[PDB]
């Protein structure tokens, strides 16, 4: 019967939307990815869930497997004495009827090499099941948001009703 799921992706070039009205989180670490596309496309969709300011809004209470892949892709030209060392972290949060956002999951990678290193490719995927109440909101936040490659096959965010 009625399907409850979503899969939304980066907007490639439009990469980041935000603008002046934008939208944010709070005591949340990193920076909220706010540019997911909000409508049907041949690679994304929303069924019984909708998007608001980069956050997926729950309509039906339940157990949801939530996941996200965020591609950190960067060319780097270091210099003299070090200062380069990146922590690439993907956070998945929820806003419930509580003032502050509550972390559900984090996944991290750190750059390695240094000096003698031309570039870095780090796709981070994580997922897991959480109970959510109607109107709970879930979003993704990341460190070094400027290194995220938002092509749609690369970075995405989704969830579906479990059981």
């Amino acid at each position: 019967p009625q399907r409850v799921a979503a899969h939304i992706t980066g907007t490639r070039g439009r990469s980041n939307t935000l603008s002046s009205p934008n939208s944010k989180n709070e005591k949340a670490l990193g920076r909220k990815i706010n540019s997911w596309e909000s409508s049907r496309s041949g690679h994304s969709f929303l069924s019984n869930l909708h998007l608001r300011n980069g956050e997926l809004v729950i309509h039906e209470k339940g157990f949801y497997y939530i996941y996200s892949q965020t591609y950190f892709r960067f060319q780097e030209e270091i210099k003299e004495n070090t200062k380069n060392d990146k922590q690439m972290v993907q956070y998945i949060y929820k806003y419930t009827s509580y003032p502050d956002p509550i972390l559900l999951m984090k996944s991290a990678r750190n750059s390695c090499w240094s000096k003698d290193a031309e570039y870095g490719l780090y796709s981070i995927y994580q997922g897991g099941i959480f109970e959510l109440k109607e109107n709970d909101r879930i979003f993704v936040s990341v460190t070094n948001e400027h290194l995220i490659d938002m092509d749609h096959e690369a970075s995405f965010f989704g969830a579906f009703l479990v059981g």
């Binding site: 670490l29 990193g30 003299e80 004495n81 060392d85 990146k86 922590q87 972290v89 419930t96 009827s97 509580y98 003032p99 502050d100 509550i102 991290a108 750190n110 460190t143 070094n144």
Partner: protein
């Protein structure tokens, strides 16, 4: 006009507590284990965080505030490096002078990030 312990105001319990499942009482959070900072309707208080071996605790967890940890002297943390404290540099590179000392939230500040000499 007679009572006992705790009941929810407009369906919300006070900081330091969480609400009962359906039965509706306001249960206290367990000191040192979990907390809640605002009026709420959580079925469970929020877990306290434990400072790790590279941090020092500034204040303990209370039923009302989460533990407050900070990087240990000689290391620091910033907005893009929330996962691990980073070692502070001992000195500035050749040709650059201090201007900014190591803080728990910042490495040393070195000048010639523009200036004459």
């Amino acid at each position: 006009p007679q009572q006992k312990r705790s009941s929810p105001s407009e369906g919300l319990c006070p900081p330091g507590h969480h609400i009962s499942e359906d039965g509706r009482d306001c249960i206290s959070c367990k000191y040192g284990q979990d907390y809640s900072t605002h009026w709420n309707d959580l079925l469970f208080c929020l877990r306290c965080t434990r400072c790790d071996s590279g941090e020092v605790e500034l204040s303990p967890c209370t039923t009302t505030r989460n533990t407050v940890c900070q990087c240990e002297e000689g290391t620091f943390r910033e907005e893009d490096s929330p996962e691990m404290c980073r070692k502070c540099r001992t000195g500035c590179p050749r040709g650059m002078v201090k201007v900014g000392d190591c803080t728990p939230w910042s490495d040393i500040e070195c000048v010639h990030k523009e200036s004459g000499d």
